[PDB]
């Protein structure tokens, strides 16, 4: 596979996102690390799909809403940042105030 250090670390984000999505599916309000994991994995999968940085800046604000997360979690998350390999190489995505 030839995994480099970042590829090994970022597998953890996907795994945490899978865990969080199972918790959401059984009706739980998500906590701070669950919410971050879901939005982060969404960004990295979007890059893999070949979306633009600008599409993901927009979409990342609509992945989770206030009624998906516990009290205070929207206000704890000022942004979420992720780097992934786009068709044009690694880029940084920053999602501002992802949960309104």
């Amino acid at each position: 596979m030839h995994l480099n250090p970042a590829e090994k670390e970022k597998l953890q984000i996907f795994l945490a996102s899978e865990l969080a999505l199972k918790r959401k599916a059984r009706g739980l309000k998500l906590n701070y690390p669950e919410a971050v994991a879901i939005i982060t994995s969404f960004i990295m999968e979007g890059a893999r799909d070949g979306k633009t940085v600008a599409m993901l800046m927009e979409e990342g604000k609509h992945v989770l809403t206030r009624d998906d997360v516990m009290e205070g979690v929207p206000e704890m998350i000022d942004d979420i940042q992720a780097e992934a390999t786009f068709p044009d190489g690694t880029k940084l995505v920053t999602v501002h105030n992802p949960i309104s």
Partner: protein, 122 residues
Amino acid sequence: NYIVPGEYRVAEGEIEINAGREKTTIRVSNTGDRPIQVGSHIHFVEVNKELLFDRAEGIGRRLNIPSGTAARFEPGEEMEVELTELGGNREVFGISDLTNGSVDNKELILQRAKELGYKGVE
């Protein structure tokens, strides 16, 4: 009773910066063709040569703006700024090498400014 973790509850009132120091308003012009942004704590007489203002009125002074902020001059822009007095020992070293000592040495500062082409030595 909604809990925002780590939130502030600030007291009433306002914070007065540089309280008790003399304030001076002057007109400053960016005569150059590239933008110039000036920080809160640069000795005002030592800014970019292409800013035209009465250089004597920048001696011993800096911008009366919140610590860590800056005044911006677009190319060709003229605007008024408010200055406050430097404090502590009122000495400046380095920066543009116009002072290298007391800010009281107005004569020497302005002679160096004029020789090096800092605009507005009057």
